[PDB]
């Protein structure tokens, strides 16, 4: 059987698209839940909006992880490539993508609750940030795995 069949690029394209799709769904949900919390509470306390906006920024970063992996995978696509490269950069796509989705759900829920509560207990804001960092790195772990796999996609490959 050939090492480089004609359908090999397919798993590359799916991996490339999957990296940004799932990551965007995570960032979208994190933005939505946080946005409702901010708008609900800042009606009575407008002076602290630009402090409470952090969860939206934190969710926004996750989309950037998907973008860079998607771009790095994209520039490795070619017409003739080993099937091994296809599977590897499919795995790179899924690992960051569905890790971003997981981190997105986490930021959305604690971001909403933290903002909702902080408006009547000023000491709680530092707690919200501290928890959000633990949620944030769940995306970062996905990125590290994706970049390790991607680096391995094209070295010592014969075709």
């Amino acid at each position: 059987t050939e090492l480089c069949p004609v359908y090999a690029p397919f798993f590359g394209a799916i991996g490339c698209a999957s990296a940004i799709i799932f990551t965007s769904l995570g960032a979208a949900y994190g933005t939505a839940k946080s946005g409702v919390g901010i708008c609900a509470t800042c009606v009575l306390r407008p002076d602290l909006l630009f402090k409470n906006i952090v969860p939206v920024i934190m969710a926004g970063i996750i989309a950037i992880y998907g973008l860079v992996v998607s771009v790095l995978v994209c520039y490795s696509l070619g017409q003739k490539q080993a099937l091994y490269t296809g599977f590897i950069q499919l795995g790179a796509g899924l690992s960051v993508g569905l890790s971003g989705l997981a981190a997105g759900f986490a930021i959305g829920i604690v971001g909403d609750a933290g903002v909702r509560g902080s408006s009547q207990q000023p000491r709680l804001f530092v707690g919200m940030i501290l928890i959000l960092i633990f949620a944030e790195v769940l995306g970062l772990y996905g990125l590290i795995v994706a970049l390790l796999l991607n680096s391995r996609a094209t070295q010592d490959v014969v075709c």
Partner: nanobody
């Protein structure tokens, strides 16, 4: 695009020696097979030597013994070391890179060597 270029062309004394070099860039894989071809003026191309990704070699009897083909350490690089030249060696030389299947067969522009 994938592209190749040779190097090391020139002119030398009879019985002398020199090294030809070739490389490729922009590729996503190690070529299964790479080879050298020779064209003296007024004649068709001659097969000189070839070497697989694993180092398996084959030569034409016209260069057997006199020439040594070798892989470089960087992916998709060749060095051809030719010694004990004779005037009949005057030719342009090309390096060729080939995939195991499909139309993906590449050729450089070639370079000149003379006595």
């Amino acid at each position: 695009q994938v592209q190749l270029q040779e190097s090391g062309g020139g002119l030398v004394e009879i019985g002398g020696s020199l090294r030809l070099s070739c490389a490729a860039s922009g590729t996503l894989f190690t070529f299964n097979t790479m080879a050298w071809y020779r064209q003296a003026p007024g004649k068709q191309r001659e097969f000189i030597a070839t070497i697989t990704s694993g180092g398996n070699t084959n030569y034409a009897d016209s260069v057997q013994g006199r020439f040594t083909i070798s892989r470089g350490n960087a992916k998709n690089t060749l060095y051809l070391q030719m010694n004990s030249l004779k005037p009949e060696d005057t030719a342009v030389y090309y390096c060729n890179a080939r995939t195991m299947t499909g139309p993906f067969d590449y050729w450089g522009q070639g370079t000149q060597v003379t006595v």
